Amino acid sequence: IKEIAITHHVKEGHEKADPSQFELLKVLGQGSFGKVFLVKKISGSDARQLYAMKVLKKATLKVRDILVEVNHPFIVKLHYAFQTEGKLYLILDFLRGGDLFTRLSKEVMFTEEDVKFYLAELALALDHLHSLGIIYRDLKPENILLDEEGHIKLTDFGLSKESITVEYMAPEVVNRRGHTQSADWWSFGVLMFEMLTGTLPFQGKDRKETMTMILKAKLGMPQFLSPEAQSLLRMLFKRNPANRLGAGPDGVEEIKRHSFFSTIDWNKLYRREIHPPFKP
Ligand SMILES: Nc1ncnc2c1ncn2[C@@H]1O[C@H](COP(=O)(O)OP(=O)(O)NP(=O)(O)O)[C@@H](O)[C@H]1O
């Protein structure tokens, strides 16, 4: 594993930035690694532009140019990174659509096909990262936002962060036995399960018990899902990572060709030709 320290970045077009070129407007949210702020760029070619800002102690990209390669239609863009006073500042797209789960909660009647749209965009994003040797690792609802047009935007791209949710973690991750991109497809299944049923597949009274459940508990198949949805769940919820959908020879194509996704034109999806089920 090649660990790439994140210390500096300037998007093409921009000029090198520093803390004095921004002003704080408000807090956008709070993550495990700290608050996320709304900031305004006060000077430079992009003066007056709004961005999100994270302030960490440090961040590294573990990989089994890169900060440009991770660019994708459904992944947040990093515009700047700089360090000042033992702190790392990350300046990112301001994602304006709020989180996906909140948008879904505002809808009484959403369908399997609605959820399928968001899962499909998420799958493209995940595979993109995998293609670069990156594993998302900590995929959870709070990382899945929407842009102003209602398309998926992940809030990170696999950074291992240090500041200044076991429910989504794969069995092989829980027991510290190993770790590959296959773990991301388990998390993917958990998100699918949760969006389609309104409940988590594994959750105990505390983290200790949740972990044991992930490793050994039975799981009932939701009976009011389509046969295709049930099949995808069965294929993602393999505790042996080598046998999990997406881990075979054809990789992500195993997922894209699955009957659940038969309605999706992946090329049109990538190009954002398909209208999202709901608008911000
Ligand atoms: N680019 C963004 N634009 C707007 N809001 C954001 C952005 N990134 C994060 N947020 C908000 O901040 C919350 C936390 O985001 P997250 O990326 O999880 O932060 P983090 O510090 O990396 N913590 P975590 O990822 O949980 O370890 C999200 O759920 C959003 O509500």
Author numbering: 47 to 110, 120 to 219, 231 to 346
Share the article's original sentences.
The 90-kDa ribosomal S6 kinase 2 (RSK2) is a serine-threonine kinase, which plays a key role in the mitogen-activated protein (MAP) kinase signaling pathway. Among the many serine-threonine kinases, only two unique kinases, RSK and MSK, contain two distinct kinase domains in a single polypeptide chain, separated by a linker region of ∼100 amino acids. Both domains are catalytically functional, and the C-terminal kinase domain (CTD) regulates the activity of the N-terminal domain (NTD) through phosphorylation of the hydrophobic linker region. The activated CTD RSK2 autophosphorylates Ser386 in the linker region, which becomes a docking site for PDK1 that activates the NTD RSK2 through phosphorylation of Ser227 in the T-activation loop.
The X-ray crystal structure of the N-terminal kinase domain of RSK2 (residues 44–367) complexed with AMP-PNP was refined to 1.8 Å resolution. The NTD RSK2 adopted an overall protein kinase two-lobal scaffold with the ATP-binding site in the cleft between the small N-terminal lobe and large α-helical C-terminal lobe. The T-activation loop (residues 220–230), part of the αC-helix (residues 111–119), and the N- and C-termini (residues 44–46 and 347–367, respectively) were not visible in the electron density map and were not included in the current model. The βB-sheet insert is comprised of three antiparallel β-strands: the β-1-strand (residues 48–52) at the N-terminal end; the novel βB-strand (residues 104–109); and the β9-strand of the activation segment (residues 215–217). In the NTD RSK2 structure, the αC-helix is pushed away from its regular position by the βB-sheet, and consequently, the conserved Glu118 residue (invisible in the structure) from the αC-helix cannot interact with Lys100. The lysine, located on the βB-sheet, interacts with the β-phosphate (distance 2.66 Å) and the conserved Asp211 (distance 2.86 Å) from the DFG-motif. Instead of the salt bridge, Lys100-Glu118, a new mode of connection appeared – Lys100-β-phosphate-Lys216. Surprisingly, the isolated NTD RSK2 displayed in vitro kinase activity toward the S6 peptide even without activation by PDK1. We present a kinase structure that would be classified as having an “inactive” conformation (the displaced αC-helix), but is actually an active phosphorylated kinase confirmed by complementary protein activity assay. Whereas in PKB this region is occupied by the C-terminal hydrophobic motif (HM), in the NTD RSK2, the N-terminal β0-strand (residues 55–57) is anchored to that groove by several hydrogen bonds with the β4-strand.
